[PDB]
Amino acid sequence: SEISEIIKGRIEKLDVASQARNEGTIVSVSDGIVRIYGLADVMYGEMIEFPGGVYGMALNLEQDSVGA
Amino acid sequence: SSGRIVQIIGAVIDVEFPRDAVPSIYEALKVQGVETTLEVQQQLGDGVVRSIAMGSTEGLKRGLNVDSTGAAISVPVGKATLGRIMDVLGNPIDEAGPIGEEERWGIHREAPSYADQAGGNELLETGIKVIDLVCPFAKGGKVGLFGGAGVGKTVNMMELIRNIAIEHSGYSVFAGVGERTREGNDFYHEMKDSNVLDKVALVYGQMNEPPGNRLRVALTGLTMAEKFRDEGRDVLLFIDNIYRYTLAGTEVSALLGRMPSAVGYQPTLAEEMGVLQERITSTKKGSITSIQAVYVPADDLTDPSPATTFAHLDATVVLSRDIASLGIYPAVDPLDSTSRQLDPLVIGQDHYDTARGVQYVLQRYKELKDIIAILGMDELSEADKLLVARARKIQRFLSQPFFVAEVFTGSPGKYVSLKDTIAGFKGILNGDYDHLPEQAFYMVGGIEEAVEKAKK
Amino acid sequence: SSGRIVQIIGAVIDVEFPRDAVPSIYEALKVQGVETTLEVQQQLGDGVVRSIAMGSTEGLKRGLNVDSTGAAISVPVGKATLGRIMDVLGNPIDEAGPIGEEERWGIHR
Amino acid sequence: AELTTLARPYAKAAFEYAQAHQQLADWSAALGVLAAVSQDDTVRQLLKEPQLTSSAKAQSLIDVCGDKLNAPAQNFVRTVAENKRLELLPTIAEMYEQLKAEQEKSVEVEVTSAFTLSKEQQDKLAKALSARLSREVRLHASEDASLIGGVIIRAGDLVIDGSVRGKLAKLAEALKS
Numbered sequence: 087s088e089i090s091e092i093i094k095g096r097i098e099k100l101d102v103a104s105q106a107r108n109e110g111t112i113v114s115v116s117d118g119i120v121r122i123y124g125l126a127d128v129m130y131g132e133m134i135e136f137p138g139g140v141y142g143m144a145l146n147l148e149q150d151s152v153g154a
Numbered sequence: 155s156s157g158r159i160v161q162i163i164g165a166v167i168d169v170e171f172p173r174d175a176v177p178s179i180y181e182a183l184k185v186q187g188v189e190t191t192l193e194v195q196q197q198l199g200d201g202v203v204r205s206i207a208m209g210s211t212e213g214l215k216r217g218l219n220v221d222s223t224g225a226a227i228s229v230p231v232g233k234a235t236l237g238r239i240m241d242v243l244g245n246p247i248d249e250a251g252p253i254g255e256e257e258r259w260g261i262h263r264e265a266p267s268y269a270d271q272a273g274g275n276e277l278l279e280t281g282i283k284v285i286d287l288v289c290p291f292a293k294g295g296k297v298g299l300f301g302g303a304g305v306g307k308t309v310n311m312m313e314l315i316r317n318i319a320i321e322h323s324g325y326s327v328f329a330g331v332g333e334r335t336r337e338g339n340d341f342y343h344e345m346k347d348s349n350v351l352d353k354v355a356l357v358y359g360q361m362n363e364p365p366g367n368r369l370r371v372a373l374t375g376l377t378m379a380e381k382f383r384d385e386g387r388d389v390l391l392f393i394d395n396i397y398r399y400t401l402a403g404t405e406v407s408a409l410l411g412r413m414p415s416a417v418g419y420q421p422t423l424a425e426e427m428g429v430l431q432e433r434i435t436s437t438k439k440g441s442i443t444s445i446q447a448v449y450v451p452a453d454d455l456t457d458p459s460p461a462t463t464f465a466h467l468d469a470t471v472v473l474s475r476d477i478a479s480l481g482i483y484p485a486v487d488p489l490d491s492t493s494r495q496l497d498p499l500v501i502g503q504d505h506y507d508t509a510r511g512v513q514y515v516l517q518r519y520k521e522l523k524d525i526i527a528i529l530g531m532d533e534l535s536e537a538d539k540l541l542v543a544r545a546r547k548i549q550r551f552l553s554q555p556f557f558v559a560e561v562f563t564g565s566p567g568k569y570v571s572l573k574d575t576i577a578g579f580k581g582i583l584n585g586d587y588d589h590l591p592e593q594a595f596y597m598v599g600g601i602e603e604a605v606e607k608a609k610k
Numbered sequence: 611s612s613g614r615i616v617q618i619i620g621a622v623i624d625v626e627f628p629r630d631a632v633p634s635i636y637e638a639l640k641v642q643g644v645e646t647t648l649e650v651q652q653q654l655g656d657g658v659v660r661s662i663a664m665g666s667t668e669g670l671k672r673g674l675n676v677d678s679t680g681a682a683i684s685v686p687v688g689k690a691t692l693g694r695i696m697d698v699l700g701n702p703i704d705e706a707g708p709i710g711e712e713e714r715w716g717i718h719r
Numbered sequence: 720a721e722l723t724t725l726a727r728p729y730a731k732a733a734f735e736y737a738q739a740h741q742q743l744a745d746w747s748a749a750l751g752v753l754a755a756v757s758q759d760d761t762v763r764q765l766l767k768e769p770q771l772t773s774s775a776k777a778q779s780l781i782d783v784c785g786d787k788l789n790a791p792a793q794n795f796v797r798t799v800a801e802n803k804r805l806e807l808l809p810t811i812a813e814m815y816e817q818l819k820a821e822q823e824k825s826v827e828v829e830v831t832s833a834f835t836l837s838k839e840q841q842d843k844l845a846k847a848l849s850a851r852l853s854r855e856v857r858l859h860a861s862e863d864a865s866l867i868g869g870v871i872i873r874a875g876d877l878v879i880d881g882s883v884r885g886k887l888a889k890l891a892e893a894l895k896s
């Protein structure tokens with residue numbers, strides 16, 4: 087490709103997290119709705135564990151977010 | 155090539171494909187490893203299609219592989235569908251093994267063309283006297299069916315199935331749109347006990363199913379009726395409610411995010427009615443005649459769902475509680491049932507004169523019944539008393555024993571031809587049978603059976 | 611750490627905070643230099659919270675520094691409230707001086 | 720909205736700066752390196768992380784690209800990232816190239832053929848297309864076994880079909896009707 091070797095060597099030392107498919111991060115909380123980045127293996131109707139013993143249910147599996 | 159699920163919102167599933175292998179509108183898709191079928195509704199761009207699932211989506215995830223079948227939803231057709239219960243995908247839902255079909259057909263096709271119309275206004279003989287006299291059916295026609303429950307709707311449907319199978323060498327297809335599961339099991343056992351199960355193919359789209367199943371189940375039953383029409387036959391197609399087909403279109407259009415039309419309906423209401431109703435016609439090979447029961451919302455005839463439905467109907471049959479409380483079966487109101495075929499250019503002058511004479515005598519008896527109720531029988535003249543006697547004879551001669559009701563009446567059933575119906579009601583209207591008692595005219599076939607009933 | 615006002619549309623005010631110091635839902639916030647309190651309704655993502663003012667928005671600008679109190683709107687309770695007129699924030703709106711309460715309670719329970 | 724609708728004022732601002740300061744090839748190399756860096760999967764995973772600010776995403780893109788960006792291109796990267804428009808970075812570069820093709824009076828023409836064409840045949844088609852379009856043309860030749868003869872010229876939305884497959888389709892439409 088047209089990527090140079092030095093630019094590729096700068097790309098390989100980037101700090102990129104390895105996102106597990108059963109893990110996610112909360113983006114937004116509003117009115118009982120929690121929209122979550124990630125969770126790439128979640129099913130429609132699957133329970134989701136939050137901290138503090140709080141549980142949720144996934145209902146909107148969108149392209150880049152999950153509404154629970 | 156296969157695609158991947160990118161979005162699950164309810165029953166609406168978006169699947170991404172490669173750009174040279176985007177599947178067509180109304181193509182059936184299969185989720186790998188699961189028993190789930192999808193039907194493509196829209197092409198959104200960048201390889202992504204938006205589709206409706208034909209079952210429950212609980213347990214589906216993004217990332218599942220989806221195969222394309224290359225065609226629309228294809229159902230089994232032919233003689234092997236008779237006696238069997240099927241869903242919208244044509245899979246059997248009775249526990250009686252696979253359907254042994256020889257042919258599968260897709261459920262989306264065009265209406266028959268302008269040059270393929272059969273022409274004329276040929277009548278379909280049902281063998282029922284009140285139907286063939288007062289509200290006659292056309293081949294290729296459509297029948298609205300009105301009334302509540304418990305007045306004999308199912309018995310009339312089994313008698314139409316038996317009469318079209320035995321006397322005309324045709325078949326029947328039932329399509330239950332929004333079928334209650336209790337009543338479908340009851341209707342299946344009633345058709346086993348009346349020996350008419352092997353004359354009809356049953357397709358149910360049940361109430362607890364998502365609304366694309368309840369949208370496409372009439373197209374499945376119409377596809378099986380089209381194969382039966384293309385074998386050269388005259389087919390009956392029964393639709394259990396046309397308003398649930400309309401409401402399933404409202405629900406599917408609300409799930410896709412379309413902007414709604416007046417009184418809440420889908421903006422494609424007349425078009426989705428016309429795609430279903432223009433396939434029910436008389437062609438050069440054979441005909442399909444449909445009997446469709448109609449619910450009216452809020453008792454409003456100018457609501458958009460019955461106003462779109464009544465533009466396609468050729469006849470109405472109204473069932474009445476007051477005729478059934480008198481013991482007269484079938485309980486068809488002769489004054490409230492209408493027909494577009496009741497016209498002297500269509501059926502001739504003789505049938506029209508006999509039917510309008512019967513309707514005048516029953517209407518005059520209807521107002522004189524309130525006169526007798528307000529002031530007594532002594533208020534009426536000799537001509538009014540003569541019309542009351544002829545009208546009670548006409549009202550009892552409209553009753554008829556049925557072959558599927560022999561447990562109920564305790565009699566053999568009768569099939570009456572149209573010639574015998576016009577000759578018998580003309581014989582009552584001309585005063586030829588005023589010497590008979592009225593109870594001879596109850597539950598016989600032709601007028602000669604009433605003549606031999608009045609010797610006993 | 612403090613945030614800054616990014617949007618004022620009517621009674622609804624959006625405040626951007628740093629990502630380690632986002633206030634919770636129903637946290638009270640104090641705008642610096644103007645006597646107005648904000649209550650957090652929603653967390654919109656990227657550090658931004660959406661809130662409703664507990665006063666008039668005529669003296670507010672974009673760019674104003676907003677501090678977080680770390681708790682909900684707390685009002686005085688006890689028998690010091692008897693005989694007094696208070697507003698929604700528990701400040702006295704008679705002219706009888708300060709309320710000498712011994713306990714304050716949050717309004718969300 | 721479409722990607723070109725969103726990518727139009729960024730490419731127009733970059734083209735007006737690079738035409739005003741005589742840095743057309745510098746910004747064309749910079750936007751090509753930026754588009755190719757933003758389409759790599761690791762950078763695309765980094766640019767969709769929710770805990771990163773827009774300034775850190777612009778700083779990571781500037782530190783990855785390095786010596787291929789001058790200081791106004793870095794200012795352009797910070798303006799693109801502050802308005803949350805980093806996914807537009809291929810489309811912006813494409814529209815910049817279209818603007819530069821209107822400035823130097825040139826058109827990029829794709830020619831597909833049934834057999835390989837020599838330099839005399841490409842110079843002949845390029846001179847005919849330069850006489851028709853009133854632009855300097857740049858041909859890009861390619862092969863196709865679907866054609867049985869002839870060439871197909873594609874220049875933007877202009878299609879000139881000289882292949883015998885199209886003449887076969889015209890004869891099929893003329894005899895079917």
Ligand SMILES: Nc1ncnc2c1ncn2[C@@H]1O[C@H](COP(=O)(O)OP(=O)(O)O)[C@@H](O)[C@H]1O
Binds near residue numbers: 305306
């Ligand atoms: N042809 C008939 N002869 C005698 N009785 C009938 C006839 N048709 C219907 N009935 C009576 O009416 C009742 C209701 O019939 P049915 O068709 O089962 O209505 P539904 O299907 O709405 O319950 C039956 O139980 C039967 O007793």
